[PDB]
Amino acid sequence: CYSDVSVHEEMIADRVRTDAYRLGILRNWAALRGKTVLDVGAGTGILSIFCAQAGARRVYAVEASAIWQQAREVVRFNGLEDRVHVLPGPVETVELPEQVDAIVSEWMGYGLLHESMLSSVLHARTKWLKEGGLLLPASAELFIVPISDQMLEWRLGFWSQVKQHYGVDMSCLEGFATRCLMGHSEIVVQGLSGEDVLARPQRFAQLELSRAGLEQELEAGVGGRFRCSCYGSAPMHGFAIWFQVTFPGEKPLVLSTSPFHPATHWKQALLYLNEPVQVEQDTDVSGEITLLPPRRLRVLLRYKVGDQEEKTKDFAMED
């Protein structure tokens, strides 16, 4: 259980994630006080306990993986076993004695595990949430922007620096490094900063989690067109995608994974072009992006940089 503890350690050590959930939940104290909550995928149980601190009478903490033992332990240890009930197994088959006033979950991320988690939360909403019940978070939004990855630039430049240190010219391996690091069709999860961002980020989709038939909409695919204009001269390496989610308040609380906001464990998802393309101030960058489900979540991208012809590059997540 090494990667098992590391995953839960990583989440809890993310103060942006954890304070956002804590405040997001607490700020609904008036709607939660004395009410019932389902925590879908409770993990170590911290979100369920946040709900109790907000005043919930009963929280059902449903967890499919072995970490539920630790959740049971943490709740019992905090003396909340009367108010938080840890239930092992998948949410799709759990039996609650009542329908709930609110659902909390932390389903977001990049890959098949997270897609499966949203589906499970939507299954639970339809099955167990009362009409007009609270969803925490309630919505998500997806953003895209052209980027220049400084770390990648260094790695691509590395082979040209070997001569200076060891008297052997390996500059000829730039082509090789580029093909290997950029020519694949995988999504790369990497943390960027604001200076990597080459234009204004564009929202390309919104997911309102209360909508019935969202499961159906997701299966078709989520996304849309985008357009933007670059800020200055740079080697454009591709696009970054990220999300935010919103907790209703009475101003809503936003948990964001943007490169301009504090770093989170989610980082951003990078879509590299096959090789770098030079952009300038006012270079138009436009395209269409679609995220959809051999069991793979495909990212379909068609884009145009400047006067270049439109190009397709499709990526995938097999997990």
Ligand X SMILES: Nc1ncnc2c1ncn2[C@@H]1O[C@H](CSCC[C@H](N)C(=O)O)[C@@H](O)[C@H]1O
Residues taking part in catalysis: 106, 115
By the rule CB under 6 A, 222 interacts with ligand A0S: yes
**CB 86, min distance to ligand A0S, A:** 24
| Residue 113 to residue 38: CA distance in whole angstroms | 20
Quick one: which of 47, 241, 253, 305 contacts ligand A0S (CB under 6 A)?
241
Considering only residues 278-317, where is the footprint of ligand A0S by CB under 6 A? 291-292, 297, 299
Q: Is 240 in the site for ligand A0S (CB under 6 A)?
A: no
Round to whole Å and give the CA distance between 46 and 172: 52
Among 32, 37, 38, 42, contact with ligand X (rule: CB under 6 A): 42
**102 counts as binding ligand A0S under rule CB under 6 A:** no
What is the distance between the alpha carbons of residues 232 and 198, in angstroms, rounded to a whole number?
7
Report the site for ligand A0S in 113-132 (rule: CB under 6 A): 114-115, 118
Closer Cβ to ligand X, 120 or 244, answer by number: 120
Core vs surface per residue 73-82: b (16+ CB within 10 A) or e:
ebbeeeebee
C-beta separation of 297 from 316 below 8 A: yes
- Is 11 a residue that touches ligand X (CB under 6 A)? yes
CA atoms within 13 A on the CB side of 140: 19
* Site membership for ligand A0S, residue 159 (CB under 6 A): no
Tell me how long the chain is: 319
Please select the residue that binds ligand A0S; options are 7, 12, 170, 207, rule is CB under 6 A. 207
136 is a contact residue toward ligand A0S (CB under 6 A): no
Task: Using alpha carbons, select from 148, 152, 60, 169 the residue that is nearest to residue 104.
Answer: 60
Binding residues for ligand A0S (CB under 6 A): 107-111, 114-115, 118, 140, 142, 187, 207, 218, 221-222, 241, 243, 245, 269, 291-292, 297, 299
